[PDB]
């Protein structure tokens, strides 16, 4: 019934049938992206029309197409031919990754480079990576992947321990041509293995860890209805899944007495970029747009009970399309559970004699994705007190290189001869806000220091200032941790019982933003990552901070083009885009497999409620 | 057996006897502080000598004394008379709290102020607050408390809902004189109650929460020996307790193979200040030094199983002295337990076919204190991967005032006519470092951006720089979140297998430091709070960042005086002092009892180990 329900296998099969009947999905076509469109703005609107957006690639080299289909009515709504040299290439296909290593194994330049290093081609793995846009004019309008080589000594060996530095190749994956092979010189291949399940490396396993048992004897406190609608401790929301963005939260609302009060209409991680900071020509092109180029939902893991998710777990198993339009289920791809979260509130009062303690808990919605060497966990948390938090967990195996003799300013040493280039992991959260409805505004709040003098004779006073962002051209903001800067999203037409506008406050971690030179290719393609906060007026087609087609696309799309419209955002339907990330100088302890590091953000009520919203929590 | 064992009831009883026989503990004497002294520096220290430091107050007006006694030998080691106008007053005594309300209840100025407001003196509670040092020359050398009034409508009523603004009194608690009563005008006393257990306010309690059962069927993974020595998952440490500082961690070390490697010699929260930013003369003097003036350990809560600490809990019950030298047990004052902490490391490798997941855990050592309206939880965490983290949890009831007609730049409105002045909560962690031994140094690490040009043709490179702090005069540092600034504590004489000095990196939260004007009394007395990081050379008597006697001390004591010695800290026995805090603009949701907010810091290994230290964690 719900328009926000997960896509079903039948819906995906029906999209395939509709495309086939329309003549759009013959044997030379491949589906590079397929996802459900959210309902347009309008309460009720069209009753039931589930629409899907499809990007269709052609392996014969014909122009690709963007197609919108109505699965309800069995019709193609629109189909447009794309000029990829202008608007960008489609996302990378899983089947294109395998092509790179195979093509290189028969290229005379590649074989000659490996022979110079006394390497057996049968043992050389090639990491196929997105190409970006640089100085190679022949790449415009072609689908290019770039390949970096690693040696696998035996089938269970971690190839990441054995990078083949000084060598890179570029491959046209449609015409199946190796365009360039670049060899800047022989580096020793690091010889130490990185096999973290080898007892020679682990030593004997610990026998000291006693079990921790987390159980819910009466079951969990949340309910799931309609497949993906959650009700938990006054919160209400729908859990969506999109092959590009991964988990998407819809319709986040809080039940305050008799009233269901909206907070966030749609929350997602709408892009994530991983730029590398090594100026070697072997790697200076390396920038992953995991969301926009690779599609993080496509690579979601099946999560194992007791290992990945511990406790009383409820799973969702989202369905995506494969490259031919057949449904593929990601079994146990989303874990949901509640967690104890320590003390919520506590006070022992001398004068009244009352001692009061209450415990907190949070609802957790998570998934994990694996892109090559890296593994990322995406965690959304809802707390009893109205706080919403996102946390990204980064782990996996660091990307490696040789460590140059004499050292490096841009690479860490992990093991003898083994380096790890400096890089960042930067996320963009897209928060389509709906604080008590859609009439919202953003205020920047700074601490204000005051000078000792008249009206402040003891020099103790301090204050704060709020500045309303009224137009998009002034809504590109930077962090300032030293002034305690936060941003408040409020509804100027909905007041609390003190006659102040209701609001939520965004607390950032204030980590560095994109470090690359502003003139670089990556700064132009990932312009969102250069500033901490952007606010736009809502528009149906403004979905991603990097635009629709990120692969091999120059600048020109995404947030800088949206904000040029300079739209009114003072008490309007607005979207907050928050950039946050980790700057990774790898340490020895990250090798041979990296312990989790985290980054995120949170939103806390700011006069949204008329008093604490957790006065009705029982004592247990 | 261990020199670091908790003080026992028998030890305190023996101190009382020694003082009594020496003639130092007559009926006019009160113990304001008593604590065990740490062993002096000595890698061959064998002969047991348990020494206690005592501050003795005299209620008849005679000079107080600082006394050191040896419990082992039954002797007074030293006894010095204190000139408090010079070096500061002794900490506030619990018995002096009651004296303020009783003295004001018979003062004709106070009674006339209450009569104008139609307040029954029997219902007026007085919060007894520390005085600080301001313009009143008559207070130098006298023990002063200041009192602010709150109305309790009935014995179980929350008086904090009913502040009596416009009224403050100063009291000499030794001569039992009311020195000043200041009445700046009548403000309405806010009438709404704040009784968070009243069903009229809570509404019906939730019936939706289902239980979360956390058990350890084989018991916990840590061992406790000698009363307070912990071994857990390669970690080794001693858990101390001091009536001023609270929980103190000693001898933090990590067992790396067959070697016990020291990391931190002593960790404590050595001061915490709560400065208020309301310029009203009723409150412009208000600054709590909860550690230095009140002693946070003496107000530690007894923690209840299943409410305060959930899971398989091991308790410590520290012993302190009362004002007469009798031992007093704080039953269940410290909770220790381990808890699951999500994913530790995870990777699914395409090329090897190996799927790997391990879970993380942390050891938790905590206590809770209550000082008047506020309640603070102090949490130390040890993680499997070598991370050490501190977290403070702030809750309780916010301090209130009237909300002025026409509003305020320095006070939030919480309820009709009820205000909450702006304030901060600022902590100082004192970390006596011992990274692989005592020869340590500190480096400041900044991210370095690079410009596009030769050697960086694509404009992607970035780097970092490290600056060694070589003398105390250059070791007062500020945060810089925009450049990703961290501090590394390393041992230049102990190298990892890559021939780099072993180290640990301190990650701050980069919250604002003290906001008061630099010329203010509070900036002088809480100078530590004006900067994020200080490094000193270790000295036995440099224990607190604010000096030994904080109460009514005129300023400059502690860190500014220590740093002025300008000692060598480059490869020496050093102490790191980290300032961190919360800036609190109270929100409606903080009333009538405030949900927990948190702040803290963490330390992560930085080439301390030769590879990841958690390769031997089993799958379970
Ligand atoms: Cu990384
Ligand atoms: Cu506060
Ligand atoms: Na919106």
PDB file of N, CA and C in Angstrom, chain A residues 190-268:
ATOM      1  N   UNK A 190      57.067  -5.236  -2.715  1.00  0.00           N
ATOM      2  CA  UNK A 190      57.200  -5.616  -1.300  1.00  0.00           C
ATOM      3  C   UNK A 190      56.884  -7.092  -1.105  1.00  0.00           C
ATOM      4  N   UNK A 191      57.747  -7.777  -0.354  1.00  0.00           N
ATOM      5  CA  UNK A 191      57.698  -9.233  -0.300  1.00  0.00           C
ATOM      6  C   UNK A 191      56.942  -9.788   0.902  1.00  0.00           C
ATOM      7  N   UNK A 192      56.842  -9.039   2.001  1.00  0.00           N
ATOM      8  CA  UNK A 192      56.130  -9.526   3.177  1.00  0.00           C
ATOM      9  C   UNK A 192      54.662  -9.759   2.854  1.00  0.00           C
ATOM     10  N   UNK A 193      54.098 -10.838   3.393  1.00  0.00           N
ATOM     11  CA  UNK A 193      52.689 -11.093   3.128  1.00  0.00           C
ATOM     12  C   UNK A 193      51.821 -10.329   4.124  1.00  0.00           C
ATOM     13  N   UNK A 194      50.551 -10.174   3.772  1.00  0.00           N
ATOM     14  CA  UNK A 194      49.636  -9.457   4.642  1.00  0.00           C
ATOM     15  C   UNK A 194      48.425 -10.294   4.983  1.00  0.00           C
ATOM     16  N   UNK A 195      48.637 -11.584   5.230  1.00  0.00           N
ATOM     17  CA  UNK A 195      47.529 -12.533   5.360  1.00  0.00           C
ATOM     18  C   UNK A 195      47.111 -12.626   6.820  1.00  0.00           C
ATOM     19  N   UNK A 196      46.073 -11.870   7.166  1.00  0.00           N
ATOM     20  CA  UNK A 196      45.657 -11.690   8.548  1.00  0.00           C
ATOM     21  C   UNK A 196      44.919 -12.894   9.112  1.00  0.00           C
ATOM     22  N   UNK A 197      44.726 -13.963   8.334  1.00  0.00           N
ATOM     23  CA  UNK A 197      44.267 -15.224   8.906  1.00  0.00           C
ATOM     24  C   UNK A 197      45.371 -16.268   8.992  1.00  0.00           C
ATOM     25  N   UNK A 198      46.594 -15.923   8.609  1.00  0.00           N
ATOM     26  CA  UNK A 198      47.719 -16.858   8.695  1.00  0.00           C
ATOM     27  C   UNK A 198      48.204 -16.940  10.137  1.00  0.00           C
ATOM     28  N   UNK A 199      48.204 -18.124  10.758  1.00  0.00           N
ATOM     29  CA  UNK A 199      48.663 -18.227  12.156  1.00  0.00           C
ATOM     30  C   UNK A 199      50.096 -17.773  12.361  1.00  0.00           C
ATOM     31  N   UNK A 200      50.936 -17.858  11.327  1.00  0.00           N
ATOM     32  CA  UNK A 200      52.297 -17.344  11.428  1.00  0.00           C
ATOM     33  C   UNK A 200      52.306 -15.851  11.722  1.00  0.00           C
ATOM     34  N   UNK A 201      51.303 -15.122  11.233  1.00  0.00           N
ATOM     35  CA  UNK A 201      51.189 -13.692  11.486  1.00  0.00           C
ATOM     36  C   UNK A 201      50.351 -13.380  12.723  1.00  0.00           C
ATOM     37  N   UNK A 202      49.239 -14.093  12.932  1.00  0.00           N
ATOM     38  CA  UNK A 202      48.371 -13.772  14.064  1.00  0.00           C
ATOM     39  C   UNK A 202      48.967 -14.232  15.385  1.00  0.00           C
ATOM     40  N   UNK A 203      49.815 -15.255  15.359  1.00  0.00           N
ATOM     41  CA  UNK A 203      50.165 -15.968  16.561  1.00  0.00           C
ATOM     42  C   UNK A 203      48.980 -16.789  17.028  1.00  0.00           C
ATOM     43  N   UNK A 204      49.109 -17.438  18.182  1.00  0.00           N
ATOM     44  CA  UNK A 204      47.963 -18.164  18.739  1.00  0.00           C
ATOM     45  C   UNK A 204      46.850 -17.189  19.093  1.00  0.00           C
ATOM     46  N   UNK A 205      45.616 -17.591  18.809  1.00  0.00           N
ATOM     47  CA  UNK A 205      44.482 -16.719  19.074  1.00  0.00           C
ATOM     48  C   UNK A 205      44.236 -16.603  20.574  1.00  0.00           C
ATOM     49  N   UNK A 206      43.670 -15.464  20.982  1.00  0.00           N
ATOM     50  CA  UNK A 206      43.372 -15.252  22.391  1.00  0.00           C
ATOM     51  C   UNK A 206      42.348 -16.261  22.879  1.00  0.00           C
ATOM     52  N   UNK A 207      42.559 -16.746  24.097  1.00  0.00           N
ATOM     53  CA  UNK A 207      41.592 -17.582  24.790  1.00  0.00           C
ATOM     54  C   UNK A 207      40.913 -16.835  25.932  1.00  0.00           C
ATOM     55  N   UNK A 208      41.158 -15.529  26.055  1.00  0.00           N
ATOM     56  CA  UNK A 208      40.755 -14.754  27.223  1.00  0.00           C
ATOM     57  C   UNK A 208      39.372 -14.130  27.104  1.00  0.00           C
ATOM     58  N   UNK A 209      38.798 -14.069  25.908  1.00  0.00           N
ATOM     59  CA  UNK A 209      37.560 -13.323  25.716  1.00  0.00           C
ATOM     60  C   UNK A 209      36.369 -14.185  26.106  1.00  0.00           C
ATOM     61  N   UNK A 210      35.660 -13.771  27.137  1.00  0.00           N
ATOM     62  CA  UNK A 210      34.451 -14.464  27.553  1.00  0.00           C
ATOM     63  C   UNK A 210      33.242 -13.881  26.827  1.00  0.00           C
ATOM     64  N   UNK A 211      32.203 -14.678  26.596  1.00  0.00           N
ATOM     65  CA  UNK A 211      31.090 -14.202  25.768  1.00  0.00           C
ATOM     66  C   UNK A 211      30.267 -13.108  26.439  1.00  0.00           C
ATOM     67  N   UNK A 212      29.763 -12.213  25.595  1.00  0.00           N
ATOM     68  CA  UNK A 212      28.779 -11.204  25.971  1.00  0.00           C
ATOM     69  C   UNK A 212      27.485 -11.573  25.263  1.00  0.00           C
ATOM     70  N   UNK A 213      26.443 -11.854  26.035  1.00  0.00           N
ATOM     71  CA  UNK A 213      25.170 -12.300  25.487  1.00  0.00           C
ATOM     72  C   UNK A 213      24.176 -11.152  25.575  1.00  0.00           C
ATOM     73  N   UNK A 214      23.668 -10.720  24.428  1.00  0.00           N
ATOM     74  CA  UNK A 214      22.659  -9.674  24.367  1.00  0.00           C
ATOM     75  C   UNK A 214      21.399 -10.289  23.787  1.00  0.00           C
ATOM     76  N   UNK A 215      20.334 -10.334  24.586  1.00  0.00           N
ATOM     77  CA  UNK A 215      19.083 -10.959  24.174  1.00  0.00           C
ATOM     78  C   UNK A 215      17.921 -10.059  24.566  1.00  0.00           C
ATOM     79  N   UNK A 216      16.791 -10.248  23.888  1.00  0.00           N
ATOM     80  CA  UNK A 216      15.554  -9.536  24.216  1.00  0.00           C
ATOM     81  C   UNK A 216      14.469 -10.569  24.473  1.00  0.00           C
ATOM     82  N   UNK A 217      14.239 -10.936  25.736  1.00  0.00           N
ATOM     83  CA  UNK A 217      13.361 -12.083  26.031  1.00  0.00           C
ATOM     84  C   UNK A 217      11.947 -11.923  25.518  1.00  0.00           C
ATOM     85  N   UNK A 218      11.442 -10.697  25.418  1.00  0.00           N
ATOM     86  CA  UNK A 218      10.094 -10.457  24.926  1.00  0.00           C
ATOM     87  C   UNK A 218      10.085  -9.901  23.510  1.00  0.00           C
ATOM     88  N   UNK A 219      11.218  -9.951  22.813  1.00  0.00           N
ATOM     89  CA  UNK A 219      11.317  -9.413  21.477  1.00  0.00           C
ATOM     90  C   UNK A 219      11.669  -7.940  21.498  1.00  0.00           C
ATOM     91  N   UNK A 220      11.865  -7.350  20.322  1.00  0.00           N
ATOM     92  CA  UNK A 220      12.262  -5.943  20.249  1.00  0.00           C
ATOM     93  C   UNK A 220      11.091  -5.008  20.501  1.00  0.00           C
ATOM     94  N   UNK A 221      11.429  -3.754  20.800  1.00  0.00           N
ATOM     95  CA  UNK A 221      10.419  -2.741  21.087  1.00  0.00           C
ATOM     96  C   UNK A 221       9.887  -2.052  19.838  1.00  0.00           C
ATOM     97  N   UNK A 222      10.490  -2.276  18.679  1.00  0.00           N
ATOM     98  CA  UNK A 222      10.001  -1.657  17.456  1.00  0.00           C
ATOM     99  C   UNK A 222       9.105  -2.627  16.702  1.00  0.00           C
ATOM    100  N   UNK A 223       8.240  -2.067  15.865  1.00  0.00           N
ATOM    101  CA  UNK A 223       7.416  -2.861  14.963  1.00  0.00           C
ATOM    102  C   UNK A 223       7.760  -2.503  13.528  1.00  0.00           C
ATOM    103  N   UNK A 224       7.697  -3.507  12.655  1.00  0.00           N
ATOM    104  CA  UNK A 224       7.858  -3.330  11.217  1.00  0.00           C
ATOM    105  C   UNK A 224       6.540  -3.719  10.567  1.00  0.00           C
ATOM    106  N   UNK A 225       5.952  -2.797   9.813  1.00  0.00           N
ATOM    107  CA  UNK A 225       4.730  -3.082   9.072  1.00  0.00           C
ATOM    108  C   UNK A 225       4.926  -2.683   7.618  1.00  0.00           C
ATOM    109  N   UNK A 226       4.159  -3.317   6.735  1.00  0.00           N
ATOM    110  CA  UNK A 226       4.273  -2.971   5.332  1.00  0.00           C
ATOM    111  C   UNK A 226       5.642  -3.205   4.750  1.00  0.00           C
ATOM    112  N   UNK A 227       6.420  -4.103   5.342  1.00  0.00           N
ATOM    113  CA  UNK A 227       7.734  -4.443   4.851  1.00  0.00           C
ATOM    114  C   UNK A 227       8.862  -3.552   5.331  1.00  0.00           C
ATOM    115  N   UNK A 228       8.614  -2.237   5.467  1.00  0.00           N
ATOM    116  CA  UNK A 228       9.723  -1.335   5.767  1.00  0.00           C
ATOM    117  C   UNK A 228       9.296  -0.106   6.560  1.00  0.00           C
ATOM    118  N   UNK A 229       8.117  -0.112   7.165  1.00  0.00           N
ATOM    119  CA  UNK A 229       7.707   0.994   8.017  1.00  0.00           C
ATOM    120  C   UNK A 229       8.016   0.657   9.470  1.00  0.00           C
ATOM    121  N   UNK A 230       8.750   1.546  10.139  1.00  0.00           N
ATOM    122  CA  UNK A 230       9.221   1.325  11.503  1.00  0.00           C
ATOM    123  C   UNK A 230       8.487   2.253  12.452  1.00  0.00           C
ATOM    124  N   UNK A 231       8.076   1.711  13.599  1.00  0.00           N
ATOM    125  CA  UNK A 231       7.589   2.505  14.720  1.00  0.00           C
ATOM    126  C   UNK A 231       8.406   2.097  15.930  1.00  0.00           C
ATOM    127  N   UNK A 232       9.042   3.068  16.578  1.00  0.00           N
ATOM    128  CA  UNK A 232       9.890   2.753  17.723  1.00  0.00           C
ATOM    129  C   UNK A 232       9.955   3.950  18.650  1.00  0.00           C
ATOM    130  N   UNK A 233       9.433   3.794  19.869  1.00  0.00           N
ATOM    131  CA  UNK A 233       9.637   4.769  20.942  1.00  0.00           C
ATOM    132  C   UNK A 233       9.331   6.190  20.468  1.00  0.00           C
ATOM    133  N   UNK A 234       8.159   6.340  19.854  1.00  0.00           N
ATOM    134  CA  UNK A 234       7.546   7.566  19.355  1.00  0.00           C
ATOM    135  C   UNK A 234       8.069   7.970  17.980  1.00  0.00           C
ATOM    136  N   UNK A 235       9.152   7.369  17.487  1.00  0.00           N
ATOM    137  CA  UNK A 235       9.631   7.625  16.137  1.00  0.00           C
ATOM    138  C   UNK A 235       8.825   6.835  15.113  1.00  0.00           C
ATOM    139  N   UNK A 236       8.716   7.404  13.912  1.00  0.00           N
ATOM    140  CA  UNK A 236       8.035   6.783  12.778  1.00  0.00           C
ATOM    141  C   UNK A 236       8.874   7.082  11.545  1.00  0.00           C
ATOM    142  N   UNK A 237       9.160   6.071  10.714  1.00  0.00           N
ATOM    143  CA  UNK A 237       9.923   6.322   9.495  1.00  0.00           C
ATOM    144  C   UNK A 237       9.774   5.129   8.558  1.00  0.00           C
ATOM    145  N   UNK A 238      10.183   5.338   7.311  1.00  0.00           N
ATOM    146  CA  UNK A 238      10.251   4.272   6.317  1.00  0.00           C
ATOM    147  C   UNK A 238      11.702   4.070   5.898  1.00  0.00           C
ATOM    148  N   UNK A 239      12.132   2.813   5.809  1.00  0.00           N
ATOM    149  CA  UNK A 239      13.504   2.492   5.427  1.00  0.00           C
ATOM    150  C   UNK A 239      13.514   2.096   3.958  1.00  0.00           C
ATOM    151  N   UNK A 240      14.099   2.946   3.110  1.00  0.00           N
ATOM    152  CA  UNK A 240      14.241   2.645   1.703  1.00  0.00           C
ATOM    153  C   UNK A 240      15.634   2.131   1.377  1.00  0.00           C
ATOM    154  N   UNK A 241      15.777   1.629   0.150  1.00  0.00           N
ATOM    155  CA  UNK A 241      17.080   1.184  -0.323  1.00  0.00           C
ATOM    156  C   UNK A 241      17.183   1.497  -1.799  1.00  0.00           C
ATOM    157  N   UNK A 242      18.293   2.110  -2.183  1.00  0.00           N
ATOM    158  CA  UNK A 242      18.539   2.489  -3.566  1.00  0.00           C
ATOM    159  C   UNK A 242      19.916   1.978  -3.961  1.00  0.00           C
ATOM    160  N   UNK A 243      20.040   1.467  -5.186  1.00  0.00           N
ATOM    161  CA  UNK A 243      21.298   0.824  -5.543  1.00  0.00           C
ATOM    162  C   UNK A 243      22.452   1.834  -5.558  1.00  0.00           C
ATOM    163  N   UNK A 244      22.161   3.116  -5.799  1.00  0.00           N
ATOM    164  CA  UNK A 244      23.209   4.131  -5.771  1.00  0.00           C
ATOM    165  C   UNK A 244      23.516   4.588  -4.346  1.00  0.00           C
ATOM    166  N   UNK A 245      22.497   5.052  -3.618  1.00  0.00           N
ATOM    167  CA  UNK A 245      22.714   5.669  -2.316  1.00  0.00           C
ATOM    168  C   UNK A 245      22.794   4.682  -1.168  1.00  0.00           C
ATOM    169  N   UNK A 246      22.266   3.479  -1.330  1.00  0.00           N
ATOM    170  CA  UNK A 246      22.191   2.557  -0.214  1.00  0.00           C
ATOM    171  C   UNK A 246      20.948   2.808   0.609  1.00  0.00           C
ATOM    172  N   UNK A 247      21.062   2.714   1.934  1.00  0.00           N
ATOM    173  CA  UNK A 247      19.904   2.933   2.789  1.00  0.00           C
ATOM    174  C   UNK A 247      19.500   4.400   2.733  1.00  0.00           C
ATOM    175  N   UNK A 248      18.201   4.635   2.569  1.00  0.00           N
ATOM    176  CA  UNK A 248      17.607   5.965   2.526  1.00  0.00           C
ATOM    177  C   UNK A 248      16.517   5.982   3.579  1.00  0.00           C
ATOM    178  N   UNK A 249      16.467   7.032   4.396  1.00  0.00           N
ATOM    179  CA  UNK A 249      15.401   7.161   5.387  1.00  0.00           C
ATOM    180  C   UNK A 249      14.361   8.157   4.894  1.00  0.00           C
ATOM    181  N   UNK A 250      13.091   7.755   4.948  1.00  0.00           N
ATOM    182  CA  UNK A 250      11.979   8.580   4.507  1.00  0.00           C
ATOM    183  C   UNK A 250      11.063   8.889   5.681  1.00  0.00           C
ATOM    184  N   UNK A 251      10.482  10.089   5.666  1.00  0.00           N
ATOM    185  CA  UNK A 251       9.337  10.409   6.523  1.00  0.00           C
ATOM    186  C   UNK A 251       9.665  10.251   8.005  1.00  0.00           C
ATOM    187  N   UNK A 252      10.816  10.774   8.422  1.00  0.00           N
ATOM    188  CA  UNK A 252      11.177  10.684   9.830  1.00  0.00           C
ATOM    189  C   UNK A 252      10.298  11.643  10.612  1.00  0.00           C
ATOM    190  N   UNK A 253       9.550  11.104  11.567  1.00  0.00           N
ATOM    191  CA  UNK A 253       8.600  11.892  12.331  1.00  0.00           C
ATOM    192  C   UNK A 253       8.588  11.394  13.763  1.00  0.00           C
ATOM    193  N   UNK A 254       8.071  12.237  14.657  1.00  0.00           N
ATOM    194  CA  UNK A 254       8.065  11.952  16.086  1.00  0.00           C
ATOM    195  C   UNK A 254       6.655  12.172  16.621  1.00  0.00           C
ATOM    196  N   UNK A 255       6.136  11.191  17.359  1.00  0.00           N
ATOM    197  CA  UNK A 255       4.781  11.270  17.902  1.00  0.00           C
ATOM    198  C   UNK A 255       4.825  12.032  19.221  1.00  0.00           C
ATOM    199  N   UNK A 256       4.348  13.275  19.206  1.00  0.00           N
ATOM    200  CA  UNK A 256       4.370  14.160  20.366  1.00  0.00           C
ATOM    201  C   UNK A 256       2.927  14.321  20.837  1.00  0.00           C
ATOM    202  N   UNK A 257       2.553  13.560  21.859  1.00  0.00           N
ATOM    203  CA  UNK A 257       1.164  13.507  22.266  1.00  0.00           C
ATOM    204  C   UNK A 257       0.303  12.914  21.172  1.00  0.00           C
ATOM    205  N   UNK A 258      -0.704  13.664  20.729  1.00  0.00           N
ATOM    206  CA  UNK A 258      -1.617  13.187  19.701  1.00  0.00           C
ATOM    207  C   UNK A 258      -1.100  13.418  18.291  1.00  0.00           C
ATOM    208  N   UNK A 259      -0.003  14.152  18.132  1.00  0.00           N
ATOM    209  CA  UNK A 259       0.402  14.690  16.843  1.00  0.00           C
ATOM    210  C   UNK A 259       1.644  13.968  16.339  1.00  0.00           C
ATOM    211  N   UNK A 260       1.611  13.544  15.079  1.00  0.00           N
ATOM    212  CA  UNK A 260       2.800  13.039  14.401  1.00  0.00           C
ATOM    213  C   UNK A 260       3.503  14.230  13.761  1.00  0.00           C
ATOM    214  N   UNK A 261       4.672  14.587  14.285  1.00  0.00           N
ATOM    215  CA  UNK A 261       5.357  15.791  13.848  1.00  0.00           C
ATOM    216  C   UNK A 261       6.501  15.437  12.918  1.00  0.00           C
ATOM    217  N   UNK A 262       6.480  15.899  11.671  1.00  0.00           N
ATOM    218  CA  UNK A 262       7.593  15.612  10.762  1.00  0.00           C
ATOM    219  C   UNK A 262       8.875  16.284  11.208  1.00  0.00           C
ATOM    220  N   UNK A 263       9.995  15.649  10.857  1.00  0.00           N
ATOM    221  CA  UNK A 263      11.311  16.201  11.146  1.00  0.00           C
ATOM    222  C   UNK A 263      12.150  16.232   9.874  1.00  0.00           C
ATOM    223  N   UNK A 264      12.311  15.080   9.223  1.00  0.00           N
ATOM    224  CA  UNK A 264      13.127  14.980   8.013  1.00  0.00           C
ATOM    225  C   UNK A 264      12.335  14.224   6.952  1.00  0.00           C
ATOM    226  N   UNK A 265      12.194  14.821   5.766  1.00  0.00           N
ATOM    227  CA  UNK A 265      11.455  14.144   4.705  1.00  0.00           C
ATOM    228  C   UNK A 265      12.274  13.027   4.054  1.00  0.00           C
ATOM    229  N   UNK A 266      13.567  13.253   3.832  1.00  0.00           N
ATOM    230  CA  UNK A 266      14.407  12.240   3.200  1.00  0.00           C
ATOM    231  C   UNK A 266      15.840  12.479   3.630  1.00  0.00           C
ATOM    232  N   UNK A 267      16.502  11.423   4.103  1.00  0.00           N
ATOM    233  CA  UNK A 267      17.896  11.519   4.529  1.00  0.00           C
ATOM    234  C   UNK A 267      18.699  10.440   3.829  1.00  0.00           C
ATOM    235  N   UNK A 268      19.837  10.824   3.251  1.00  0.00           N
ATOM    236  CA  UNK A 268      20.667   9.864   2.540  1.00  0.00           C
ATOM    237  C   UNK A 268      22.096  10.375   2.512  1.00  0.00           C
TER     238      UNK A 268
END
